[PDB]
Write a protein that binds this ligand. Structure first.
Ligand SMILES: *[C@@H]1O[C@H](CO)[C@@H](O[C@@H]2O[C@H](CO)[C@@H](O)[C@H](O)[C@H]2NC(C)=O)[C@H](O)[C@H]1NC(C)=O
Ligand SMILES: *[C@@H]1O[C@H](CO)[C@@H](O)[C@H](O)[C@H]1NC(C)=O
Ligand SMILES: *[C@@H]1O[C@H](CO)[C@@H](O)[C@H](O)[C@H]1NC(C)=O
Lengths: 916, 225
């Protein structure tokens, strides 16, 4: 902290892919109300695209937004599958009323009107319908629709008539409609019609004009209609009479509108005949007419300026499916007549490739000349928000990358660098003249260079939407973006730095390993981590599903770290797998061991590496899934160092840490979820010989467990069900007073089981993410970056979590300066590495060693992404920011003159004394 | 190793050296400026010079024949002659001398303390030899590290080493036996001890054998030109 806000740290707030959006607002209100797939309800500034008020929710589906509506100035939302309905004041940025609802799967939501004004909400669940007041949310009336045990309701309609229309269908069979009254709610009427060809109502059918139901029928290429106000039998109109046809293997849709719930719907509506094809149809008393046909158009949208409806149609400049260049034009068409608006065409280009717009929400207003001026928020396929304004300059207003809401993996890449003695002297003196000339002469990804302290790196981020980003670690800006086509949401990623920027003759090179979960096939993408472009080195095609990957420290000739993959057939594939690489890893084969942790079966296997690139069953253990399921397999970071091999115990003696570099820390939960019988096991299984160093099982405890594994110790936070309190438990591994094998450490040559020191602390809050502070040489003290749900980042000193803290202080403890054991761990607000930059729904904390020895770079990723530096040792090796230059220089240059003056004084006094 | 900040050199290493150098010069110059000779009356200087003559006589009366020497002895320490017998006789000075003695080290320690406060929290230099771990609490004042090598030193001990290594330089440039470093009242007893010493002394006329030791070798004469 130290009140130097914004000097080094930066936070970016990211919401997820925009599931539901609302643009309709006052022209001066300049607000967007959006609920995303991340359970987040937020308000975006229309002008610049910034958060006004953001309300995240539970990450699980138990707070998922299911339906949004806007009325006047407050937005009404439904969450938890219709369980709760809330009203949010868009201006203040808070709730207005929160009401829980009854059981039953929600199917349709709508509003009702008495005579001219909407005042109640009609919410329909698969078995019932409910009315709630707008003023307070009080339930008006609940009616169980008849026969609903068989029908599935799909829509709700009401308008100024003071009645409620309910519609339900049964697949490939008859459908039913119910008339309720807003005043009471009783079943005013009920009708049923036969729809043998119908599948579902919401996706296919629609309702236009005066509640007239319209189902597009692709079986007969027609438009089945039912004048729902009066008609009791569906009518049919073929599209051939209107010169229209449906696509093959597609579900045509119908898009009506309703400028305000009180009035009836507009007669005109859209029909999605086939993909890249739309029609405008105007229903008028049993017959319909084609207003305008839009071929090769991706997305259409409707808007109302208050009196007239406006349709926005999206298509690229010239089709080449796909589109020639990602240049999409949106045109305005009046809804009263299928006529394109004048001077309203917008044209933009999508930066990425393989990405096409997915969602389009437009907001309209009256210009000075009464011309419909509109803006368009378009979400692409790769979860990117673009705000397009009509005026040509800056055709995009604010481009928001919501995709970065869900980051899977990220890495920090260093920036690029900025025989005879006579020959040596000649070149050295030449260099001297060159440097002298350079000094005397002193009288953006293009120029990217490494800092002096290496404190400014570049973060290569991977997003489950399959998107790769390059973000400057200092400013947080994006330097390069790439997209991976066809990446499933649940795919597993793995990013590896094959070659850093310290090899100027060779390009930097990183490898990302993705693995589709459903198929099992894994692929390797090699790219320059600085520029983001795929390397020309074609990665091998991983034919078989793979299980694990290793980044061997051995490097190819071009300083590319060898990467090994173990496939499903337990074979090993190398990369680059050249002759030199093949020889090196074939010659060093028996010293390479894989461990595969099958969590489903509770099995651990450890395989050797044969000379001929084959694996053999070296060791195998089985934790029975019937009583224990593996939940964490946290091993120690490979890229860390230990400064002090042993520790001073006082007494002028040393206690040796048990530095096992092949030590797993497999943490498993108890399959018994009872609050009194649950337990959490931690096994310190070795990674080579498979030996379980320790097999601790904490009783009466429950997950989730957040474990950090470091040089020697492990720290795993958990929940204690017996006392209902989050608890830590530090396990420190210590060897004897004298080291067993020094020169080198081998997991096959450790017959002495290391002693374990344990201690359980109480944490007075929850947790969201943990990660130890890592330094280049490990000299700087270790800190745990506790991630609280609140968003803060506690910097807990590891020295506090010592298990050797005695319960009663003694002379040995005082000599060693050991604090007496205190089961309570403080959450002092002064320890947070962030002040108020809370990272809502924190997902992980990345710690980078950086340069120097006191500064560790921190990137907390979750919904928001925040970056800073931490000084676990108070930045001991850097000049203080409050140095008194004007004092040191002043004393120096007021003391040199003092020295001169006092020398003169001494001379004068000596002369006078000599002469007397 | 450690990538130390370059600015630690330009603002914490060199300024310490400059400060030490010029503080030594200032201290020496202030010392010579402050020194004022105390007024001495005729009697004290007279008796000091008299005992000086007596002692130099005791030292080298060998180049004087025996009778002259024993006449000197009679004059100095002998009842009949009378000499050496009828020859005898918070305060500001203590505070002044105590302050003068104190100002040779205490200013250095105060400067060290001021530097320790001013330059607390740094790592100035790495001592190129492996110091013991037990010296850590004082070499690395202002550093929170635990596993840091003892060879890394804070500002205070670096200043101490600087002030330790500059006395020879002071003698080199300022002049020999400079005052920038770190480190008779009673005549009656003096009269009696001179009495006893010159009583104990004997005579050996060194000229008793000069001629014989001169006749042995010819007189040096070259270089007459
Ligand atoms: C809240 O966060 C902001 C942004 O990080 C902090 O920024 C400024 O801090 C200075 C501190 O003197 C204030 O004077 C400014 O008004 C802040 N700017 C804002 C709030 O926009 C701010 O300090 C943080 N506040 C707290 C209490 O941590
Ligand atoms: C489209 O054209 C623009 C302008 O030439 C160009 O910058 C862009 O890369 C092109 N392609 C895409 C996919 O946007
Ligand atoms: C360690 O074990 C190896 C054998 O594995 C042995 O040769 C060596 O002497 C032992 N000690 C050290 C310090 O390496």
């Amino acid at each position: 902290y130290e009140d130097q806000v914004g000097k080094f740290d930066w936070r970016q707030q990211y919401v997820g892919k925009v599931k539901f959006a609302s643009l309709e607002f006052s022209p001066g209100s300049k607000k967007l109300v959006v609920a995303t797939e991340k359970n987040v309800i937020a308000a975006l500034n229309s002008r610049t695209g910034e958060i006004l008020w953001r309300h995240v929710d539970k990450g699980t589906a138990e707070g998922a937004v299911d339906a949004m509506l806007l009325h006047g100035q407050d937005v009404i939302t439904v969450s938890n599958g219709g369980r709760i309905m809330r009203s949010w004041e868009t201006n203040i940025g808070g709730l207005n009323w929160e009401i829980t609802l009854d059981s039953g799967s929600f199917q349709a939501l709508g509003l009702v009107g008495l005579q001219e004004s909407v005042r109640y909400i009609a919410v329909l669940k698969k078995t019932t319908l409910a009315l709630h007041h707008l003023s307070s949310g009080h339930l008006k009336w609940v009616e169980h629709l008849p026969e609903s045990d068989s029908i599935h309701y799909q829509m709700v309609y009401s308008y100024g008539s003071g009645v409620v229309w309910a519609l339900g269908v049964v697949p490939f069979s008859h459908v039913n409609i119910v008339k309720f009254n807003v005043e009471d709610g009783e079943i005013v009427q009920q009708v049923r019609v036969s729809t043998p060809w119908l599948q579902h109502l919401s996706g296919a059918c629609g309702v236009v004009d005066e509640a007239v139901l319209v189902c597009p029928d692709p079986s007969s290429r027609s438009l089945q209609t039912l004048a729902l106000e009066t008609e009791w039998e569906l009518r049919q109109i073929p599209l051939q009479s209107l010169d229209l046809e449906f696509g093959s293997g597609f579900q045509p849709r119908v898009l009506p509108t309703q400028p305000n719930p009180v009035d009836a719907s507009r007669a005109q509506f859209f029909l999605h005949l086939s993909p890249s094809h739309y029609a405008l149809l105007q229903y008028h008393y049993g017959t319909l007419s084609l207003l305008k046909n839009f071929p090769q158009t991706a997305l259409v949208s409707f808007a109302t300026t208050g009196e007239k409806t406006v349709a926005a149609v999206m298509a690229c400049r010239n089709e080449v499916l796909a589109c020639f260049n990602q240049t999409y034009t949106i045109n305005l068409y009046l809804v009263e007549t299928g006529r394109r608006l004048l001077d309203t065409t917008i044209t933009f280009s999508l930066e990425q490739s393989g990405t096409r717009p997915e969602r389009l929400y437009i907001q309209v207003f009256l210009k000075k000349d009464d011309s419909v001026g509109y803006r368009a928020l378009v979400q692409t396929e790769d979860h990117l928000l673009l705000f397009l304004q009509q005026l040509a300059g800056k055709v995009v207003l604010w481009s928001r990358e919501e995709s970065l809401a869900e980051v899977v993996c990220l890495e920090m890449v260093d920036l690029p660098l900025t025989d005879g003695l006579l020959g040596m002297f000649l070149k050295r003196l030449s260099s001297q003249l060159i440097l002298l000339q350079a000094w005397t002469s002193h009288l953006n990804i293009d120029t990217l260079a490494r800092d002096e302290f290496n404190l400014q790196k570049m973060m290569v981020m991977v997003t489950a939407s399959g998107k790769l980003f390059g973000i400057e670690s200092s400013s947080g800006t994006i330097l390069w973006k790439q997209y991976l086509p066809n990446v499933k949401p649940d795919s597993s990623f793995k990013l590896m730095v094959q070659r850093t920027t310290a090899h100027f003759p060779h390009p930097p090179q990183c490898t990302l390993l993705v693995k589709d979960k459903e198929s099992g096939m894994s692929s390797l993408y090699v790219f320059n981590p600085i520029f983001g472009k795929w390397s020309q080195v074609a990665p091998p095609v991983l034919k078989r599903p793979i299980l694990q990957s290793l980044l061997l420290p051995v490097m190819d000739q071009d300083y590319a770290k060898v990467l090994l993959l173990i496939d499903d057939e337990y074979k090993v594939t190398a990369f680059p797998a050249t002759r030199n690489v093949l020889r090196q890893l074939h010659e060093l084969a028996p010293s390479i061991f894989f461990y595969l942790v099958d969590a489903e079966q509770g099995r651990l296997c450890g395989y050797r590496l044969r000379k001929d690139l084959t694996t053999e069953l070296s060791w195998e253990l089985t934790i029975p899934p019937e009583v224990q399921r593996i939940v964490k397999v946290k091993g120690k970071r490979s890229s860390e160092h230990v400064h002090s091999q042993g520790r001073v115990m006082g007494d002028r003696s040393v206690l040796y840490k048990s530095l096992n570099p092949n030590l797993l820390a497999v943490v498993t939960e108890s399959t018994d979820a009872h609050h009194e019988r649950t337990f959490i096991g931690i096994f310190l299984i070795d990674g080579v010989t498979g030996r379980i160093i320790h097999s601790s099982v904490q009783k009466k405890a429950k997950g989730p467990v957040h474990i950090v594994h470091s040089e020697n110790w492990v720290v795993y936070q958990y929940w204690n069900t017996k006392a209902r309190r989050n608890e830590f438990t530090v396990l420190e591994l210590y060897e004897g007073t004298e080291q067993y094998n020094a020169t080198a450490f081998s997991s096959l040559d450790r017959p002495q089981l290391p002693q374990v020191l344990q201690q359980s602390y109480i944490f007075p809050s929850s947790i969201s993410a943990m990660e130890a502070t890592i330094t280049e040489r490990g000299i700087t003290s270790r800190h745990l970056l506790i991630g609280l749900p609140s968003g803060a980042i506690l910097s807990l000193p590891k020295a506090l979590l010592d298990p050797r803290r005695p319960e009663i202080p003694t002379e040995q403890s005082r000599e060693e300066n050991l604090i007496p054991y205190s089961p309570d761990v403080q959450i002092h607000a002064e320890r947070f590495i962030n002040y108020n930059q809370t990272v809502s729904r924190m997902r992980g904390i990345y710690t980078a060693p950086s340069g120097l020895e006191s500064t560790c770079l921190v990137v907390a990723y979750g919904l928001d992404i925040y970056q800073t530096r931490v000084y676990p040792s108070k930045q001991f090796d850097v000049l203080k920011d409050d140095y008194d230059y004007v004092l040191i220089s002043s004393v120096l240059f007021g003391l040199v003159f003092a020295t001169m003056i006092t020398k003169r004084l001494a001379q004068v006094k000596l002369l006078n004394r000599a002469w007397r | 190793e450690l990538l130390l900040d370059s600015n630690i050199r330009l603002w914490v290493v060199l300024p310490i050296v400059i400060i030490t150098f010029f503080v030594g010069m200032i201290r020496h110059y202030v010392s010579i400026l402050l020194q004022s000779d105390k007024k001495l009356t005729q009697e004290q200087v007279s008796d000091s010079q008299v005992l000086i003559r007596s002692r130099v006589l005791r030292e080298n009366g060998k180049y004087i024949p025996k009778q002259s020497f024993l006449t000197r002895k009679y004059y100095f320490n002998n009842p009949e002659d009378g000499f050496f017998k009828k020859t005898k006789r918070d305060p500001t000075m203590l505070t002044d001398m105590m302050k003068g003695n104190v100002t040779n080290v205490l200013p250095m320690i105060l400067i060290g303390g001021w530097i320790n406060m001013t330059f607390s929290g740094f790592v100035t230099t790495k001592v190129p030899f492996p110091l013991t771990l037990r010296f850590k609490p004082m070499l690395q004042q202002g550093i929170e590290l635990l596993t840091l090598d003892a060879s890394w030193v804070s500002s205070a001990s670096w200043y101490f080493l600087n002030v330790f290594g500059l006395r020879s330089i002071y003698s080199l440039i300022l002049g020999q036996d400079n005052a920038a470093d770190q480190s008779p009242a009673d005549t009656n007893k003096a009269f009696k001890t001179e009495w006893e010493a010159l009583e104990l002394t004997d005579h050996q006329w060194a000229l008793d054998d000069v001629e014989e030791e001169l006749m042995a070798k010819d007189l040096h004469f070259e270089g007459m030109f």
